[model samples]
Target: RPRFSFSIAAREGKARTGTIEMKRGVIRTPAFMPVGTAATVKALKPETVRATGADIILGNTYHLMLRPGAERIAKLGGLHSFMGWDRPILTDSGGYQVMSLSSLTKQSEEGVTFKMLSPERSIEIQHLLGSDIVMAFDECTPYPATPSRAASSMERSMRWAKRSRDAFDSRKEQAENAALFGIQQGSVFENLRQQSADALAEIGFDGYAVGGLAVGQGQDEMFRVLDFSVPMLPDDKPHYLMGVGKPDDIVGAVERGIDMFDCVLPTRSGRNGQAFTWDGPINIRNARFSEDLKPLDSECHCAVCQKWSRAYIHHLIRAGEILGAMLMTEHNIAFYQQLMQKIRDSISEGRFSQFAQDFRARYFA
Candidate 1:
């Protein structure tokens, strides 16, 4: 197989069902990658994550480097072996974490030289981590910024995108087995988005991501930006939206042409005793669920739902048992995978719009 290739199996408007073929594994389109920051998906084992039907997962560059260290993992034979996730792993460029996590960081037209995470350094780190899909380093333009600030951020990100690509290409052995994606960061300006897209297209990548939204922008604004920005990307490559949202948010983004997503929502919410169901997200810690002899979600077929009851889960959560977080996290990740499967089926059957409508009708209603 090729290092990376994407094929759209079906399409409903801009919504698509496709496959991203990579050497490590094949990712089904409209896929939601569970965030495995710090080498684990928190609360769940790699085997459990695989059981959720996830074709791929994401690793945070900053977190790994800061603690266990990327070079350390490389020495241990890369992230897949160290984490025991044999499937594909996509690693970020550490740029977003630098912006969000560090106060001592400095940025120049050349790169985010935290010495810590320059474009070249970030790429090198990701390579050492053996990321199957390596994201280009770019500033995630913050929301609520002035147009000029957004413009400068996008332009600077475009420069960094080129540098990231150059650095990825410089490593010949890793470049062959791995794929690189360029992020489009223009905040919400259509013109800026277009420029960013053009710059990424000119430089080329295995995938194009719609970045800069979901920072603090409402779904309305995120979708509005996607309506314009997604079309500007290369149709043949996978289109990823970074750090995206809830169940309904994923449905909305899929309808607007996003192919891949990674978020900490499911796992994070699960750890907090929240469960996502077909009806909506529910708090398991609520007293209402106590003594409620029911599955987390009647429609769910995950191990937690198949073998456990809401009342038991409620008790576990209320009592602060570690098993509570494990079960909850498992179910949430399973639910997300199930949603993605439904999305693919809907697009394949030409009922994506109706599915989207029904999903929103129930999930947000």
Candidate 2:
């Protein structure tokens, strides 16, 4: 077991550069963790994921617990061995899925009770996942919710955050290598968000996560909540924003001082033939790409971009080749990693504001 330490290398506006030193590896701050929901980042190997410069990956408690059972993975030598990824792994607490996927989830002060996907199975299976960062189980208050509804959900989550902390503390072995992170859920209300943050901070954990944002609140509202909520968190601990977003969303969140993020956009978009590039996101399936001779991004040094032409990629996507997903996914992951590197560099050089302005001008212009 190794201790975690964060060092702020530089800051420009709310945007900053930092490093998270853990036993397994050093995760550069303003980091974007690729989602490996079902123990894999589809269409790419674990080593290939690392090659993209990601220091860590995210695992979903809802998906893994349902399919493989966390105990099975533990017996099989933990997630690192099961997933074939030696780097750090951050696992969700199945809270989001309980609210989203479970057929008959009933939330209460005690905890959420829900039926498994199978008719024959009935389990509230969250506590056994053995994640590196065990999130407190909570309801994802639906958007357009009433203020009272949001307050109720936030209060319930605070109570569950305590339960999650208690449960995690009881697990002697799993608690050693891993840490627990409390989730703050107040919907879009600033006062509620502040209350949730205060409660979580008082209860305390290794880190804190701002949840209930990206579900449908949109980017502007999310940023507004973060603006008020982030500064309220313990500065010495890492602050993670759960289920975050696209390239622009990432840049904006980093500019607001969020240290960690995870999203399924790149992988999900790659399967649909979308590729994020330096200039902007491009659809490889567009007919204009059929005869284009340039790389996906001429500026990209990713192997897929370096070795494959846009025309070739377009043809592959049009023909529905599986390799197209693999190549595009690889490139998308590489593009995100490269973006993080640039963000780190900009902060270190005290030019993050300039970097952000240039990024928006080129990508959004």
Candidate 3:
């Protein structure tokens, strides 16, 4: 089995292009991981998801454990064979949903024991389902928290992080099979962020994630938290920004040292008639596009852009045709891939600052 490790290839300012090599696959950064909530990226085939230039995809333990059950998936020959996608897969620790979804959850110094799977079992299931990258269990602190509340939450998360590390490390098979990442939770308090980062560093993990942002916090605040939060994480390990956001958000995050990300925006927005472009996101179902004969984005090279016109997609969406959803989503994923390609290229050639400035100007223009 090949060992998991990350190495930087180039750096332009804070933006770095890197690669993560494991037995399962090689994921290049800065990379976008499409959210496969129920073991699939909605409206796109597994093959198509791969073709979209995604090096990895995310699986949610919260949904998976409740639905078909993790053990069921393990028996079905792991996520890769079950989903029919042969690439790197990362599974969340399910702690996020315990707080967000379940109402009766109780917490202690141990771990989440009610309203969700235990921290012990969460990582275990991730390993069973054959995840190439796993997340350490930690409570996702909500925004607008008091300093005391944030500190308490951060400290609890640190304790759970230690338990998660112990539980996953107990199974030496998990070490060989996948990499476990620790999540830092401090809301927006810089001091608490440093504390959480230091605690996770003491326990150690294969990688680290800057969590507890983008939950109703505006872009400015999210970036503010990341500015201080990201630097606290260990330098050599892969840095992931969990549940991250839109086109500008992704680009900004890359500039902040995030190596990996997962979000539902591109696929979800595409199904709702929002088509991303170099200029901006264009609503395909609008009355303005009814008779527009141009492609979705004239600058895009996706098959949907090369073949279909705005008018045709508009007609399908208005008429409730499935093809509309397929085409729109296909183009959106392609657009994100193209954007990442531009970021990587600029970082390698040492022009990321100019590239980002030009992109933001054109995108918001």
Candidate 4:
């Protein structure tokens, strides 16, 4: 079995339909990975997540490092066995979380000390977590930065990417059947993004991640950066957009050639009484759903949608019932997977542009 490999099956405009072959499983592209921070997809079971059509899920290295301790999980049979998820788990190196979630952080040319997490250590912990796809440790550049600030951050991340690669390479046992992805981080500047991409390509990676956008950069600016940044990386490899985004954002990113994505919106929104439908997102807590007999989405055929009514979901949410969150999460995740299937089909059929136009129109209509 290949440790990691990507192949494009078809293309329409800039959109692509493909598969990422990994040891654990095959991920279809323009794939959307549900975030499973702390080894759980929150409110849902691992089998349920797989039933939702997910090929892979994401876990946070920081969460495991702090909560369960990476060593404990590894000794206890690693994250997959611990969490009951046998499919691929893409673990983020702790760098981004430390910068965003940590209150106190000290920085140096070496690495951030959100109480100190070096690139080598971050890589080690991710391997301990049995990461199929390991993200390289690097600072996710904060948005609205000056050119100088962006350059400094991007350069630092490039250095870290090299260190992360070397560290991952050091462990031959850990490196077996595991893939490392380097992140390009240059906020919104095209020149900086290109430079960051060039640096990452030089260091090399199993995949390339377009990071630092979607941190409040708005849709227009994010797409603009992707326009230039994506092409800078090698076409034969997989391209990932980190921490992105809405359904439309996913479509737009795929249109621009991004092959992989991970986001927290679906589950988080479900917990908040929001559900995404073919039309758009709707809040189930609204009074209008109190007596509605319809499913969350008329077009959805997931277990939740097939068996439950909007009125029941609304009552559960309003009554603060835990089951509401679980049902809603399952439905939303299934919706996302269904969207990916449609995207891949549209690309394969060479009708992606029309699909994009119609989807945006109906979603906004």
Candidate 5:
């Protein structure tokens, strides 16, 4: 079995920075993992992704399992080799997509059953991915659900968490290089969240993920859940929060003790001409940028920011050139990477609390 360990390098307020050492490589945290949903990060090469200071990226079990199939990748020497990214890759269980994309989903003690887009086929595909960190398959426990409804879904997810653990244990050889993480799912209910955490603790896993809160629950609610859920999880193992958000969200979660996170906001927003900066998000396509000769962010040292002016990028986007998205996404990703690096540094230096306060002051000013 592969061994992994996390050591805190710094801490500020609730924010912290650390390093996670695994057999694959050392992942610096709080880290921002770029989303390579379909085996690629869209227009960015693997080398470019590494150049942006990202230590890891994310793969989706739902998309990969449905399209190319995990068995094919396994036959071709697993996802890292197949995708040409030698670094670490974390694969999410298809639970989110199964509930969001599939036409019909039936949950039971066994597992979730769903019909795919093609009427000819319907299957459960997560267990086959064989990733570095395999997430448990569980319902997201949608928002607005009554406490009872949420509890029922959370309980069901707990059962599925066990099933996922069993499936992963059964395939230890197949996933020899990987670790499996159990996800805690309980809407906004504190007792349910506690129950879910306790259940996953008993089941045991290489890591534990605080899931189901980011969907529609606001940041305050999410943080509240984390306050209870994070402490309940085993401290020895890493804690990951799936599908997180913007700059502040990352800082807040890290302060609350989350060790890992993945989000597409930076890349996705970049493609739409939005650039996240210390001052907040700015849209390059706006008229204000037409004559601006400044870099996207004066503080950013990325290739795009250092070499190209906002006016030039604005022209590219207005002309509908592909390079606009590519360059913008590159800058956005670099910005996020730099943010993570700074956060880690602040924690290590024991100035995270002041650093976080100053960050928010500037970001929201």
Candidate 6:
């Protein structure tokens, strides 16, 4: 097994292209992690996901824990073995799920305690599942909360993060090989974000996540927070923007120094008859696409685009065929990976600003 590490290869303004060295493999940064919430990326097999150029995929603690159960999965041989994905895997702390899913939940100075488990147990499960990247437990502050309410939530998140740090380290060998990431939570206040970052920096983890944004805060507001909040974290380690976003959103975050992200947008949209392209997102189920014979994206070179036509996809979607979702998901995943690759190239070549401008210019929505 290899110890986790990071190295910067190129930088353009706050954006940089880097590589995350891990035992499983190297993850090229400004990377995109497609969601494998229940230990698998929906509608696509493990090899298919790898074919799309994703070096890493995310697992959901809450979802997996509830269905097959984490302890049971550990007995069956961890997430990687069970899911058959040999690549690097990241898992959330289960804090967000605990807060969102549990109607019977309570937050305290110690940590969040839900009907299902404690934050301590959440960290324990992530270790048991053999996650290469384990996120710290923190409250994902909701939108429109008052500064006072947000402050309280963020303060407790810091406390939970410390407890997470202590418990995660108890795994010893697993802790050494895997990376623990602390989440910075503070609704939308710059000062609170700074305070959260400072706290996490004190009780340090291997990486940092800009959590709590994109929870209903629109694009402009999300970018506004990223402007100040991203630089607040340690510049060396990977900066993960959790649960973020569409194509244009990813470009903006990379420019603000975010090195990694995970979102269900691509796959989720695919299942819903939508497609992401270099130009913008489109509803393949639209009546206009019914008779239009063309690739999903004229600029894309993905296998789906090469072999399939929008008219065919539209027909499948309208007829409610399973292959429709699978093909659409594959197309979206490929487009997302290509976008990340382009962003990395732009950063390495010192032309990210121009690249971003060009992307936004073409991505009219």
Which has the greatest TM-score? 4
Worst 10 residues of 4 by lDDT: 109-118
- Least accurate 10 contiguous residues by lDDT in model 5: 116-125
- lDDT (Cα, 0-100) at 202 in candidate 5: 96
Q: Give candidate 5 misplaced runs (Cα > 4 Å).
A: 12-14, 116-130
Better of 4 and 5 by TM-score: 4
Off by over 4 Å in 3: 113-116
* Better candidate by lDDT, 4 or 6: 4
Q: Which ranges in model 6 have alpha carbons more than 4 Å from their true place?
A: 113-116
TM-score (all chains, Cα) for each model = 0.98, 0.94, 0.96, 0.99, 0.93, 0.97
Q: Which prediction has more favorable lDDT, 3 or 5?
A: 3
Worst 10 residues of 6 by lDDT: 110-119
Instruction: Tell me the tens digit of each residue's lDDT in model 5 across 55-124.
Output: 9898877778767877777677777877788877787777688778876787666666777311111112
- Cand. 2 TM to true fold: 0.94
Name the weakest run of 10 consecutive residues (lDDT summed) in model 1: 109-118
Q: Give the per-residue lDDT digits (tens) of candidate 1, residues 103-209.
A: 77787866664534778899999999999999998888778888899999998888888999999998998789999999998888889999999999999999999
What is each predicted model's overall lDDT from 0 to 1? Answer: 0.91, 0.81, 0.87, 0.91, 0.80, 0.90
Tell me the number of clashing residue pairs for each predicted model.
0, 0, 0, 1, 9, 0
What's model 2's lDDT at 250?
85
Q: Tens-digit lDDT track for model 2 on 288-308?
A: 999998989979989998799
Q: For model 2, what is the error of residue 22's alpha carbon versus the real structure, in angstroms, after optimal superposition?
A: 2.1
Q: Write the per-residue lDDT of candidate 3 for residues 177-264, one digit (tens) a residue.
A: 7888999988999999999999999999989999888688999989888888888999888899998889899899989988888888
For model 6, the local distance difference test gives 0.90
Model 2 clash pairs are none
Residue 131 C-alpha lDDT in model 4: 91
